[PDB]
Scaffold this active site. Structure first.
Site, mmCIF file in Angstrom:
data_model
loop_
_atom_site.group_PDB
_atom_site.id
_atom_site.type_symbol
_atom_site.label_atom_id
_atom_site.label_comp_id
_atom_site.label_asym_id
_atom_site.label_seq_id
_atom_site.Cartn_x
_atom_site.Cartn_y
_atom_site.Cartn_z
ATOM 1 N N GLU A 136 0.866 -1.215 0.000
ATOM 2 C CA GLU A 136 0.000 0.000 0.000
ATOM 3 C C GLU A 136 0.893 1.252 0.000
ATOM 4 O O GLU A 136 0.889 2.036 0.940
ATOM 5 C CB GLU A 136 -0.909 -0.031 1.218
ATOM 6 C CG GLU A 136 -1.923 -1.160 1.123
ATOM 7 C CD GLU A 136 -2.961 -1.184 2.200
ATOM 8 O OE1 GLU A 136 -2.732 -0.578 3.263
ATOM 9 O OE2 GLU A 136 -4.000 -1.864 1.996
ATOM 10 N N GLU A 163 -7.048 -6.796 -1.653
ATOM 11 C CA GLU A 163 -7.564 -6.953 -0.295
ATOM 12 C C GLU A 163 -8.944 -6.338 -0.235
ATOM 13 O O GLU A 163 -9.132 -5.220 -0.702
ATOM 14 C CB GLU A 163 -6.740 -6.210 0.782
ATOM 15 C CG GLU A 163 -5.269 -6.701 0.875
ATOM 16 C CD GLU A 163 -4.467 -6.050 1.984
ATOM 17 O OE1 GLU A 163 -5.105 -5.410 2.856
ATOM 18 O OE2 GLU A 163 -3.190 -6.144 1.946
#
Length: 373
Positions: A160, A295
């Site tokens: 991320e 995710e």
């Protein structure tokens, strides 16, 4: 040269078992499962309460209906900090997990995860040079060690990455290019392996705003994009109220409360999901680039009781079905985030200690959403 070269045995390019384009490979995946809070755990594989990944787990994942696993991996804590050399025992351990997943006919996505923050929180001009050097050194090692796996194995360069503006986006583009270049340099099947590149913070809106191009690649049509999804935060992840907002307990048409209406969503419902996924359809999928939804999951709130719990679990289940179905409809490949936990504020659908199904309601939701049931 901050670090030695780890491109120590570059191999002849090899397209054996690597025949699928990124688009063809994406067609083979409808539902993925993250091995969360496991190989990326700080302190070691078991340090966050999950057992070591077993063949039996991976068998259960496949038999339960998943096509793929995403395996977050930690590396920095296993590396000599002077040389960037990763522990041989850890490389072998990762390789063993990959082999088991492939033996169970799963596609497998390996990454460098948050990993203590060295890249992820440092998408800056000050860290650019040293982080490109570590990114190169690590990826040279990981790719070399996992080179002989066929197209069941994909690599994802980052997790991320915290890029917040255009200047930081150029730094991220550097890190992503360093990744592709390192993998490709090792040759063998890595000359053709499908690679996955992360949008800024893996956030759909920031990616829409800031993305320019894929890294340059010597291979043709072998790249995917990746975003993550926890919208709306108040429902999916928020564990306490704040000055700025309240936890949502309930979600989805039909599953709202008539009593504690302050726990129904004020935003982030079905139409917002559709709009967000449409951004990625236009930006990537429609340009011939598959999108990994790397995710997503809304946590269980087992601190609720009675009718509040029942309603919560119904909307939670529907949320997972809806995200899965709407992702797939738009060319996004949905990978469920499973932290292994079966307690409050967790997302484990399996009981890892017994290789059994803990949350059949979410599992059913995912399979129904994927058109598997």
């Amino acid at each position: 040269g901050l670090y030695p070269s780890y491109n120590t045995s570059p191999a002849a390019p090899d397209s054996t078992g690597m025949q699928s384009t990124a688009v063809q490979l994406a067609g083979k995946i409808r539902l993925g499962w993250n091995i969360g809070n496991t190989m990326e755990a700080i302190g070691g594989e078991t340090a966050w309460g999950n057992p070591m990944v077993s063949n039996e787990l991976l068998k259960l994942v496949k038999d339960s209906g998943f096509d793929a696993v995403r395996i977050p991996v930690a590396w920095d804590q296993y590396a000599n900090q002077e040389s960037a050399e990763i522990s041989a025992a850890w490389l072998n351990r990762v390789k063993q997990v990959v082999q088991m997943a492939i033996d169970n006919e799963l596609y497998v996505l390996i990454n460098i995860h948050w990993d203590g923050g060295w890249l992820e929180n440092n998408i800056t001009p000050a860290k650019k040079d040293e982080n490109n050097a570590k990114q190169k050194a690590f990826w040279e090692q990981i790719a070399t060690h996992l080179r002989d796996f066929d197209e069941h194995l994909l690599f994802a360069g980052t997790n991320e990455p915290n890029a917040e503006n255009a200047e930081q986006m150029d730094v991220l583009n550097s890190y992503l290019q360093t990744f592709v270049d390192a993998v490709r340099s090792t040759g063998g099947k890595n000359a053709y392996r499908v690679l996955v590149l992360q949008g800024p913070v893996t956030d759909i809106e920031k990616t829409n705003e800031l993305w320019t191009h894929m890294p340059a690649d010597t291979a043709t049509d072998r790249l995917m994009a990746e975003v993550h999804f926890y919208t709306p935060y108040n429902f999916a992840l928020m564990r306490q109220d704040e000055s700025w907002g309240k936890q949502f307990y309930y979600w989805g048409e039909g599953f709202l409360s008539t009593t504690d209406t302050e726990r129904n969503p004020t935003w982030g419902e079905e139409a917002t999901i559709d709009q967000l996924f449409d951004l990625m359809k236009t930006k990537f999928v429609d340009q011939g680039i598959p999108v990994v939804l790397g995710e997503f999951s809304a946590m269980r709130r087992t601190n609720l009781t009675g009718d509040a719990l029942t309603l919560h679990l119904a909307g939670r289940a529907y949320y997972h079905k809806y995200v899965t179905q709407q992702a797939l409809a738009r060319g996004l490949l949905p990978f469920y985030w499973d932290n292994g936990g079966n307690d409050n504020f967790s997302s484990g659908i399996f009981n890892r200690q017994q290789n059994t199904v803990f949350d059949q309601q979410v599992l059913d939701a995912l399979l129904e959403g994927a058109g598997a049931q």
